[PDB]
From a paper:
Isoflavonoids play important roles in plant defense and also exhibit a range of mammalian health-promoting activities. Their biosynthesis is initiated by two enzymes with unusual catalytic activities; 2-hydroxyisoflavanone synthase (2-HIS), a membrane-bound cytochrome P450 catalyzing a coupled aryl-ring migration and hydroxylation, and 2-hydroxyisoflavanone dehydratase (2-HID), a member of a large carboxylesterase family that paradoxically catalyzes dehydration of 2-hydroxyisoflavanones to isoflavone. Here we report the crystal structures of 2-HIS from Medicago truncatula and 2-HID from Pueraria lobata.
Another 2-HIS native crystal form with a P21 space group diffracted to 2.0 Å resolution, and the structure was determined using the molecular replacement method. There are two molecules in an asymmetric unit which form a dimer with extensive interactions. The heme prosthetic group was observed in the structure of 2-HIS with well-defined electron density and is located mainly between helices I and L with the I-helix on the distal side and L-helix on the proximal side, surrounded by helices C and E and the loop before helix C. Cysteine 449 acts as the 5th ligand for the iron of the heme cofactor. Remarkably, however, the location and orientation of the heme are quite different in 2-HIS compared with other P450s (e.g., human P450 2C9). The heme is moved, relative to that in human P450 2C924,25, toward helices C and E, with a distance of ~8 Å between the heme iron in the two structures, and helix C has also shifted, by ~7-8 Å. Compared with P450 2C9, the plane of the heme protoporphyrin ring in 2-HIS is tilted down ~50°. The two propionate groups also rotate ~90° towards the substrate binding pocket, a very different configuration from classical P450s, in which both propionate groups form a strong charge-charge interaction with Arg or other basic amino acids. An observed structural feature of 2-HIS is a large pocket at the edge of the heme, close to its propionate groups, and this is likely the substrate binding pocket. However, based on the present 2-HIS structure, the substrate is not able to fit on top of the heme iron, being located in a large pocket at the edge of the heme and close to its propionate groups.
Numbering used by the authors: 30 to 96, 108 to 283, 289 to 421, 431 to 434, 438 to 520
Write the structure that this text describes.
Amino acid sequence: SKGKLPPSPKPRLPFIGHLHLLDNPLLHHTLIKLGKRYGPLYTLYFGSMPTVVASTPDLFKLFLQTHSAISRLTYDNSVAMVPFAPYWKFIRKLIMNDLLNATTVNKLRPLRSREILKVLKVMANSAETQQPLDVTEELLKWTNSTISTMMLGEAEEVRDIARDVLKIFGEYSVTNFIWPLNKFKFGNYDKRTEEIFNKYDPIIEKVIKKRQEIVNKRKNGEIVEGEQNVVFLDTLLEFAQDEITKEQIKGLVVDFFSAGTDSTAVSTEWTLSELINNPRVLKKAREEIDSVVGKDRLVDESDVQNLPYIKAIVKEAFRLHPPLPVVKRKCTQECEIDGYVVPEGALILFNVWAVGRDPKYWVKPLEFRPERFIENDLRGTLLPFGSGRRMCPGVNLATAGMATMIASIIQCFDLQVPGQHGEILNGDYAKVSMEERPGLTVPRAHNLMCVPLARAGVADKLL
Ligand code: HEM
């Protein structure tokens, strides 16, 4: 018990604290340089707010222990609603009563498979035209559609809400500087953005109405025909009035759309980019798929458990390119971490990007070497056991779902990299830039452009 904060740099300035030292939009690079001098736990003042920066796994675990836990999720996204929002108590009761469980997420697999197939068919078309495909854009549409279809169904009104949610996400990303809602200003927008906002509430109200009558017709024993797929919202509506309000249902839907869907699109692109840049690993990945699954049917989500190298590839891309390089938490009460005092209300920053590249934990950390997870949650979480990860379609998409998409892509296609003067790069130049774009979520700065090439025995046997 040293009775003092973790060490801090100099100088601390009256109003801005240490903010003048943050001279890099990619904050995690600056936090590493500071960590080299001041150690694995140090204090920065974001204005008047003390902010403690940790960069070891042991420090992360200390911040997750109970005193009430000394740190909590922030409201940067809707995941914080799970422990804190009162209307999420309804979800917790469904879980404890075995009415919402892992089987609920497993039964959505056919919906997830059809969304995967849609992407493969887009790539197949680009293979036939031999035209560059914006894989970044396709992965954003894939994750956005899969979330909305799992939640609400295949109706055309859900296609409309998916396009609207993606547009809202677009307006949410332009208010971002480094972290979201930092350059936001109270303004008037325009008629274009106004129509985007006003479209959401009437569309979701109609979708809930159309799903409520399906639930009622199933409850009263009446037969239903047309769309036999059961959506996640149907499970919520089926027990909403047992013996939760419409507004609170709409609030759950808002939370379901804003928990970080884009993280899966970002991590999928980082993984594909590492595979393109590491032909040895990509060849070995296709050999596993050809051996475990074969060339006669598409990879299925049930195969992922039998694809250890594919799972190691996802872990290895997560180690090098965590979607959130800096994870934020808030101190809930005065506590002591490794002898230092952490004050109530302090912002806590986990530099997970630094840990992923630290030679103290990883042999040759700059190498994309999935074997490190073999020769010795397929991403390799901070929420306690029993928080509901097993019942969440978003966690499924971020793990088994992304692994299935990546395996399906490389099973069917070679990814050619187009060049800047009428040529396809290959093979020493067949690489993509790994430069980062600043953000809370940090994607590749350059969109992933690829010219798919159908592998031999794929068009007729698979697509
Ligand atoms: C119904 C549709 C739902 C959607 C579309 C959705 C969406 C998401 C997404 C996109 C994430 C981010 C996962 C990641 O990238 O790491 C997430 C996280 C999470 N969700 Fe959901 N969710 C849904 C329902 C639920 C439910 C019912 C629960 C019940 C407790 C739940 C609990 C969680 C938890 C605990 C996390 C955090 C997991 C972690 O950080 O490791 N979700 N959700």
